[PDB]
Amino acid sequence: NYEESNLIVFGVGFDGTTSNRPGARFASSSMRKEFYGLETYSPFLDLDLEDYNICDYGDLEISVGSTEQVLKEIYQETYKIVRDSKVPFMIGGEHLVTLPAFKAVHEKYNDIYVIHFDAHTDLREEYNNSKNSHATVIKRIWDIVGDNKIFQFGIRSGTKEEFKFATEEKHTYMEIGGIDTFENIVNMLNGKNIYLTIDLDVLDASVFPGTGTPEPGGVNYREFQEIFKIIKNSNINIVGCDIVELSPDYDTTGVSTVIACKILRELCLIISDKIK
Ligand SMILES: [Mn+2]
Ligand SMILES: [Mn+2]
Ligand SMILES: [Mn+2]
Ligand SMILES: [Mn+2]
Numbered sequence: 001n002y003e004e005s006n007l008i009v010f011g012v013g014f015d016g017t018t019s020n021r022p023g024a025r026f027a028s029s030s031m032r033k034e035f036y037g038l039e040t041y042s043p044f045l046d047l048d049l050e051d052y053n054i055c056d057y058g059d060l061e062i063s064v065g066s067t068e069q070v071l072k073e074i075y076q077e078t079y080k081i082v083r084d085s086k087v088p089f090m091i092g093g094e095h096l097v098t099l100p101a102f103k104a105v106h107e108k109y110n111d112i113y114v115i116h117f118d119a120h121t122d123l124r125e126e127y128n129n130s131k132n133s134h135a136t137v138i139k140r141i142w143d144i145v146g147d148n149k150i151f152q153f154g155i156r157s158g159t160k161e162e163f164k165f166a167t168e169e170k171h172t173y174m175e176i177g178g179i180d181t182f183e184n185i186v187n188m189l190n191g192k193n194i195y196l197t198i199d200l201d202v203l204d205a206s207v208f209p210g211t212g213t214p215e216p217g218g219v220n221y222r223e224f225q226e227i228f229k230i231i232k233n234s235n236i237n238i239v240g241c242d243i244v245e246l247s248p249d250y251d252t253t254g255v256s257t258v259i260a261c262k263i264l265r266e267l268c269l270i271i272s273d274k275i276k
Helices: 024-035 067-083 095-108 137-145 160-167 182-188 226-232 255-275
Strands: 007-012 054-059 087-092 112-117 150-155 173-176 193-199 237-244
Touching (some): 007 067, 024 087, 024 255, 067 087, 067 237, 087 095, 112 137, 150 182, 182 226, 226 255
Parallel strands (some): 007 054, 087 237, 112 150
16 A cells, blocks of 8 residues: 555656657566566575565556657656655656656755666766657756766666767766666765666677666676665665566566566665665
């Protein structure tokens, strides 16, 4: 139930700005018919979903034919959750859904930090002639928070300019080709408010092929799950979270969906435990 839970999970089946690889729209619904049979207990974290109050808000009803309209709707849903002093956990399609969600969170937490997991920088100003795209989401967010607020991990694909923007111009912190520095970054953000956005393609392409733009050279699941332990043992405050870019049909084995489901579980556990 809404009022009793501190974590509100909802889906956003939207991929309106994705041209050649649509499908992220099916992420939450694909996970829905799968999540049912997975264990509620996590042996890795030694936590159980059953010990917490988590609300399954289902999928957000969104308009069709207008990206602009969809973003406003996501913003609205997120805002109400934030307004009610609860943590919004969005399971979206494309990465653009993170922009309005982040805004709703930033409205209350002006001094917030962003933790970004992705195979792509998402720092380009435009993509397919649009300023608002899954590929420009972090640039949009940087326009809101500025330098020394964004931390990116696992990045391994992008234009030279996008990388310079972070590495040379230092507009964001970026760990290229890995996530090994995550524990250090998290400890440094001790006691800070964080918006965690996880683009699932941060995982290696052969491990998580059910995504729009697979990129070889990523981390496997065993390596990735370590971030859950690091967050659990840290003192960071996640006030907003999301996982995105799961595009089911592209992984005929169906394993990508299972991976998303498990990641969803561990994250709920981690956040739910901190809120206590
Ligand atoms: Mn990506
Ligand atoms: Mn992307
Ligand atoms: Mn992304
Ligand atoms: Mn391996």
